[PDB]
Write a protein of this length. Structure first.
Lengths: 6, 99, 275
């Protein structure tokens, strides 16, 4: 599952 | 900065005349990512050729697999033709089943 | 054994030919399981392994949203990088990003990764501490300052120690039939005379998974590291990999040469000769 650059 | 592709032309399975197989051209180690790859049958471009999605190695250089189903014979010659900015002229690598 | 999850991303600008093309792929070990291509018909993240297909539509919706948002941030980042390097808008440039985690046989985190390259060169990398950055040049130092002020490393650490490991463990279970099976290499040696005085011995490894392998030639028991031709491990297209190693030998001395093969799928390293 991906990470999202917040 | 530019890195020229390493080129390998080969069959998925050991080649047996009259037996369906897959012909592969693996290009790796190159940058920039723009590249043109054709598979050739007796010097002519094979129409239906698929390729993997662009990915890259730990050193950031790109690799791609081009492939097509084919049934090798005794007489039919196969090759991979690659062009890239690092290349004066397209490089042709012939398939050598006897490797 | 140990396992890894990696997401790879490439954006390539093409001035005068539309917006940058964005391609991202996800891997567990050497198995592709998700893809996204901005030039596709109706771009969505697509499955590429059977064990990910069971994830629900919520999973695919979120993944596709993330992929599209990453394409947009990449476009912004490419414009920023032109400024950072005082470059023209005329040329094509490349932005690459990889992130992921490695876990041990127990599923424990071994380490996490998050790193970027511009035009094929190291740009900025999260350090193994998951708390500090290595910037390659004064341009990347600007990104470093920005990411430090935004506490990006703390957010990545939380992901890499949490969801990264947890979802890799989930994928490993759901795909255990394939992801946790090592296929050993099928091996043989071929002989091709070059001349009346020399011949090529080529040691072949075929049909193995995962890709990691060691092929070495010994002469009288001594590794021929300097004189061995070793091609890049290559994909067969059926999930397995291939590789060969070749040496040039004096004619008549073939039996002094031995090929040694090490692979996870082998209980013991193999020793082979030309028959």
């Amino acid at each position: 599952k991906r990470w999202i650059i917040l | 900065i530019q890195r020229t592709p390493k080129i390998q032309v080969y069959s998925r399975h050991p080649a047996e005349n009259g037996k369906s197989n897959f012909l592969n051209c693996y290009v790796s180690g190159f940058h920039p990512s723009d590249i043109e790859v054709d598979l050739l049958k007796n010097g002519e471009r094979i129409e239906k050729v698929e390729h993997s999605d662009l990915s890259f190695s730990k050193d950031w250089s790109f690799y791609l697999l081009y492939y097509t189903e084919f049934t090798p014979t005794e007489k039919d010659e196969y090759a991979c033709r690659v062009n890239h900015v690092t290349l004066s002229q397209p490089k042709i690598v012939k398939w050598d089943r006897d490797m | 054994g140990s396992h890894s999850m990696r997401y790879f991303h490439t954006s390539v600008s093409r001035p005068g030919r539309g917006e940058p093309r964005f391609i991202t792929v996800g891997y567990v070990d050497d198995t592709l399981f998700v893809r996204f291509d901005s030039d596709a018909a109706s771009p969505r993240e697509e499955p590429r392994a059977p064990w990910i297909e069971q994830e629900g539509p919520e999973y695919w919706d979120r993944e596709t949203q993330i992929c599209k948002a990453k394409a947009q941030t990449d476009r912004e980042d490419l414009r920023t990088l032109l400024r950072y390097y005082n470059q023209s808008e005329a040329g094509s440039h490349t932005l690459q990003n990889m992130y992921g985690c490695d876990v041990g046989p127990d599923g424990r985190l071994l380490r996490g990764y998050h790193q970027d390259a511009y035009d094929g060169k190291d740009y900025i990398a999260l350090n193994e501490d998951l708390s500090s950055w290595t910037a390659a040049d004064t341009a990347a130092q600007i990104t470093q300052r920005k990411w430090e002020a935004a506490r990006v490393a703390e957010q990545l650490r939380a992901y890499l120690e949490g969801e990264c490991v947890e979802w890799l463990r989930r994928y490993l279970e759901n795909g255990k039939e394939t992801l946790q099976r090592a296929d050993p290499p099928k091996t043989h040696v071929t002989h091709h005379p070059i001349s009346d005085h020399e011949a090529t011995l080529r040691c072949w490894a075929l049909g193995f998974y995962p890709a990691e392998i060691t092929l070495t030639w010994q002469r009288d028991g001594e590794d021929q590291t300097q004189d061995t031709e070793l091609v890049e491990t290559r994909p067969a297209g059926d999930r397995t990999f291939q590789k060969w190693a070749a040496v040039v030998v004096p004619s008549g001395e073939e039996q002094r040469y031995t090929c040694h093969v090490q692979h996870e799928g082998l209980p013991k390293p193999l020793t082979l000769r030309w028959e």
